[PDB]
């Protein structure tokens, strides 16, 4: 009847409540995951039945406004959202994905597909701000939830909507994909801090597909060619194998 729902509120959010939330999100993403090896592999999109394809993340704030994000279990990424009686989707990359999203929010009166995709390069263009200048934390997420809701009423302009997607995607999708990024959000919540992600976080986000490829194509957990990541200060270093990454990457897109 309905896809699995995970609830989170910014209202009185704690390190523990955020941890419980990301744990529950990874739980629903990995129901059909390959968990035989050191790092979970999300299910292959090829031949995945439609009734296993999505999970719903219902977000609430101090204002008790609620939006529901749809996440694709094959890549943990946001494909669209519902606010009241309206649903909004990123432009699908192909006809199969366009058909898949017709199964989301089947109830809603108003369905809209954005002209644009949900990739960071495009969202940063629409927001007029790079990830390095968009603060993350409980405050940004509370504001993002209100902005996503008030898009449905005409109260939110597209640049603020795009900025709000950048906040939600990093604090939910990227936190689910990477223990390192979950921990970055735990630190911000603990200290009631709002701060932009440093180069270590941004390079990790940028590298998710490349890391999923290198790990799954590895010779007994040794890479064909090394992958470059960044330290907090932006200095580059090489990763030659999966070993150092098991604590850092929680979920991988199917590769082969
Ligand atoms: C996420 C990048 C990463 C991957 C694997 C192992 C270590 C790292 C570092 C993050 C920050 C570092 C620093 O500031 O020195 S090093
Ligand atoms: Cl649709
Ligand atoms: Cl900027
Ligand atoms: Cl180091």
Q: Of 168, 10, 4, which Cα lies nearest the Cα of 90?
A: 168
Instruction: Go through the chain and list every residue after which a break occurs, taking a C to next N gap over 2.5 angstroms, comma-separated.
Output: none
DSSP state of 32: T
β-strand partners of 66: 60
The whole-angstrom distance between residue 81's C-alpha and the CA centroid of its chain comes to 13
Backbone dihedral angles phi then psi of residue 209, each to the nearest 5 degrees:
-60, -50
Rounded distance, CA 173 to CA 17, Å?
17
Q: Which residues contact 72 (CB under 8 A, 6 or more apart)?
A: 45, 53, 54, 79, 100
Q: Of 153, 148, 178, 159, which Cα lies nearest the Cα of 58?
A: 148
β-strand partners of 228: 238
Experimental structure resolution, Å: 1.8
- Listed as own residue / partner, the contacts of 156-160 with beta carbons closer than 8 Å and 24 or more positions apart are 158/126, 159/126, 159/127, 159/128, 160/127
Query: 120-127 vs 158-168: helix axis angle to the nearest 10?
Result: 140
Rounded distance, CA 111 to CA 98, Å?
13
CA of 213 to the centre of ligand 2 (A): 30
Q: Around Cβ 251, how many Cβ atoms within 10 Å? A: 23
What technique was this entry resolved by? X-ray
Burial class (CB within 10 angstroms; exposed 0-12, middle 13-18, buried 19+) of 18: buried
Output the six-digit token pair for 201. 């976080």
Of how many residues is the chain composed?
Answer: 256
Catalytic status, residue 177: yes
**Tokens 């059909």 label which residue?**
32
3-state secondary structure of 59: strand
Catalytic status, residue 190: no
Q: Which of 151, 177, 182, 184 is catalytic?
A: 177
CA of 109 to the centre of ligand 2 (A): 12
Catalytic status, residue 77: yes
Output the six-digit token pair for 5. 């729902």
Distances (CA, A) of 242 to 49, 212, 246: 30, 10, 7
Rounded distance, CA 179 to CA 251, Å?
9
Q: Around Cβ 59, how many Cβ atoms within 10 Å? A: 25
3-state secondary structure of 119: coil
**Tokens 């292959």 label which residue?**
44
Q: Which of 3, 18, 77, 88 is catalytic?
A: 77
Confirm if 111 and 87 have CB atoms less than 8 A apart. yes
Rounded distance, CA 66 to CA 88, Å?
15
The domain ranges of the chain are 1-176, 177-256
C-alpha radius of gyration, the chain, whole number: 18
Distances (CA, A) of 122 to 76, 95, 106, 119, 174: 18, 20, 27, 6, 17
DSSP for 44-56, written as a single string: PSTT--GGGSEEE
List of E strands, the chain: 5-9, 54-60, 66-72, 77-83, 86-89, 110-113, 227-230, 236-239
Burial class (CB within 10 angstroms; exposed 0-12, middle 13-18, buried 19+) of 163: buried
Is the CB–ligand 1 distance for residue 246 below 6 Å? no
Rounded distance, CA 45 to CA 54, Å?
11
CA of 159 to the centre of ligand 2 (A): 23
């Amino acid at each position: 009847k309905q896809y699995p729902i995970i609830n989170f509120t910014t209202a009185g959010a704690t390190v523990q409540s955020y941890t419980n939330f990301i744990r529950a999100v990874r739980g629903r993403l990995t129901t059909g995951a390959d968990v035989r090896h050191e790092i979970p592999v999300l299910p292959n999109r090829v031949g995945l039945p439609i009734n296993q394809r999505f999970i719903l993340v219902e977000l609430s704030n101090h204002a008790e406004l609620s939006v529901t994000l749809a996440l694709d279990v094959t890549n943990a990424y946001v494909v669209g959202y519902r606010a009241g009686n309206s649903a909004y989707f990123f432009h699908p990359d192909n006809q199969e994905d366009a058909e898949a999203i017709t199964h989301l929010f089947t109830d809603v009166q108003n369905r809209y597909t954005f002209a644009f995709g949900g990739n960071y390069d495009r969202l940063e263009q629409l927001a007029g701000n790079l990830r390095e200048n968009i603060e993350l934390g409980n405050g940004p997420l509370e504001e993002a939830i209100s902005a996503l809701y008030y898009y449905s009423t005409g109260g939110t302009q597209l640049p603020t909507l795009a900025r709000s997607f950048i906040i939600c995607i990093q604090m939910i999708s990227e936190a689910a994909r990477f223990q390192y990024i979950e921990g970055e959000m735990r630190t911000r919540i603990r200290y009631n801090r709002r701060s932009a992600p440093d180069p270590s976080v941004i390079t990790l986000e940028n590298s998710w597909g490349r890391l999923s490829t290198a790990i799954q194509e590895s010779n007994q957990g040794a890479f064909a060619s090394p992958i470059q990541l960044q330290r907090r200060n932006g200095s580059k270093f090489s990763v030659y194998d999966v070993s150092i990454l098991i604590p850092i990457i929680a979920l991988m897109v199917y590769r082969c």
